[PDB]
């Protein structure tokens, strides 16, 4: 099965009206480093919720 | 004597696509679709120069009929009374007085009622 | 034979692709208007 007519650039942009990305709103600040991180994730320097959890 | 067609064919295509502005989709971009749409727009315009005269007389008569019934007479008796009273005002002007000068329209109705009675 | 194809130089006989009676899944019951 294939199209009988070429769909337009209008119809193509209507289908892509749900393809947009969601930006993350939730950057937490760790309470002893001051570093930003995702919620319930560790920091880049290896802290989580105030303590050094990974010695990396 | 070899003739290249680049300059002449480009000017001919650009002339059609200038007349196809405001049209939807490929009708304003693509020459095969735009040329076809400019011809149909010219057939409609030729036909509607005749239809414009029909639609305005239709609008004048409907307005004369409404303002004459405000004075107790229909359209078909008001036209017959004005022809009997030798009044030669056309339907464009009658429908214009019926909107903008309502007591001058009342004077024409009383003239038409007198010629019928 | 198609001897100087520039889009498909690797193949010379291509009618087994698009002609319906020359495909491997052609059945002669499709030709029942006899």
């Amino acid at each position: 099965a294939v199209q009988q007519n070429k769909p337009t650039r209008s119809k193509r942009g209507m289908r892509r009206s749900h393809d947009a990305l969601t930006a993350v709103t939730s950057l937490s600040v760790d309470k002893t480093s001051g570093e930003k991180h995702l919620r319930h994730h560790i920091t880049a320097d290896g802290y989580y919720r105030g303590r050094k959890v990974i010695a990396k | 004597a070899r003739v290249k067609r680049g300059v002449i064919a480009r000017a001919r295509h650009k002339k059609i696509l200038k007349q196809a502005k405001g049209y939807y989709g490929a009708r304003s971009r693509v020459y095969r679709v735009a040329f076809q749409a400019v011809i149909k727009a010219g057939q409609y315009a030729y036909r509607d120069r005749r239809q414009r005269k029909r639609q305005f007389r239709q609008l004048w008569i409907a307005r004369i009929n409404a303002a004459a019934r405000q004075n107790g007479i229909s359209y078909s008796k008001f036209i017959n009374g004005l022809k009997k009273a030798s009044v030669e005002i056309d339907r464009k002007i009658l429908a214009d007085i019926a909107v903008f000068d309502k007591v001058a329209f009342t004077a024409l109705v009383e003239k038409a009622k007198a010629a019928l009675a | 034979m198609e001897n100087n194809s520039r889009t498909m130089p690797h193949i010379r006989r291509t009618t087994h692709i698009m002609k319906f009676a020359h495909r491997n899944s052609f059945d002669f019951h499709f030709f029942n208007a006899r």
């Binding site: - | 409404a66 405000q70 464009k92 309502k102 | -």
Partner: protein
């Protein structure tokens, strides 16, 4: 000179109340369709709604002639297969009497977005009472 065109922001609409007791259905509906369209005004424009607001009282007491109280049949389809449904005039009066005048006027109005906006000015009531006293409707003895 170009012919006058009514402008929809400065059009004057007025309010009327009509009593449908003992009126013939279609002969009442033709006059309601004129005034919702604005055919009775000299400022009539075919693309502008220049009509009036009309309240219709006592829709359950409208009259038909002949044997049409038992023989006039209203049909509709539901969109599901085998879904043709019918109702006589007597059943439309007993169940939902305002629809009888609303269906009759809707067929006499133009079809399109302007005719649907002309229909919105019709207010039909089954009884002798309306609650539009703040708009001060004029009695239209039609």
């Amino acid at each position: 000179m170009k012919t006058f065109t009514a402008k929809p922001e400065t059009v004057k609409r007025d309010w009327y109340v009509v009593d449908a007791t003992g009126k013939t259905l279609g002969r009442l509906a033709t006059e309601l369709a004129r005034r919702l369209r604005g055919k009775h005004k000299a400022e009539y424009t075919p693309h502008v709604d220049t009509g009036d607001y009309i309240i219709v009282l006592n829709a359950d007491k409208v009259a038909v002639t002949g044997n049409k109280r038992t023989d006039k049949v209203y049909y509709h389809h539901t969109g599901h297969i085998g879904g043709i449904k019918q109702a006589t005039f007597e059943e439309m009066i007993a169940r939902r009497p305002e629809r009888v005048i609303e269906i009759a006027v809707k067929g006499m109005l133009p079809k399109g977005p302007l005719g649907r906006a002309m229909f919105r000015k019709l207010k039909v009531y089954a009884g002798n009472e309306h609650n539009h006293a703040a708009q001060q409707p004029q009695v239209l003895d039609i």
